[PDB]
């Protein structure tokens, strides 16, 4: 319990003081030079945020991690999907989740995500 968050978890913001804690952790490690973990943590709280610029910053931090940590790349595709989805970029979200789905046809979390993305795409076009 449990490998990824739910899309629902993605829509529950942290309390401001929780987000600030995650920010101060990255500050304490030098910002750009912070650990992958501490940066992911802050990025995930930013993705959860109802502020569009926070969400963009979270996605940006996640693409950094994707670029720099090959071992983390499959894992980051899941977050990049949710990020783009919250941002209205469903074409990008479909792309990411398709890659990820090619590596896990049997994972129920991914198929749940994939389904949401394609339901949204369906609904919006139309």
């Amino acid at each position: 319990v449990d490998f990824w968050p739910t899309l629902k978890d993605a829509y529950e913001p942290l309390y401001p003081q929780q987000l600030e804690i995650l920010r101060q952790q990255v500050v304490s490690e030098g910002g750009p030079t912070a650990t992958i973990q501490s940066r992911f943590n802050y990025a995930w709280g930013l993705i959860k945020s109802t502020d569009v610029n926070d969400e963009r910053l979270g996605v940006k931090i996640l693409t950094d991690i994707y670029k720099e940590a090959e071992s983390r790349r499959r894992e980051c595709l899941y977050y990049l999907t949710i990020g783009c989805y919250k941002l209205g970029e469903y074409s990008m979200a479909k792309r990411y989740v398709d890659t990820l789905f090619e590596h896990e046809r049997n994972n129920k979390q991914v198929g749940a995500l994939k389904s949401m993305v394609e339901d949204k795409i369906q609904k919006e076009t139309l």
């Binding site: 968050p5 995930w44 894992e75």
Partner: peptide, 20 residues
Amino acid sequence: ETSLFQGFKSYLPIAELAIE
């Protein structure tokens, strides 16, 4: 390897414990 999300779920309860 233990997930990023798993590391995140560990971090915040402990950080909040540290607050005074």
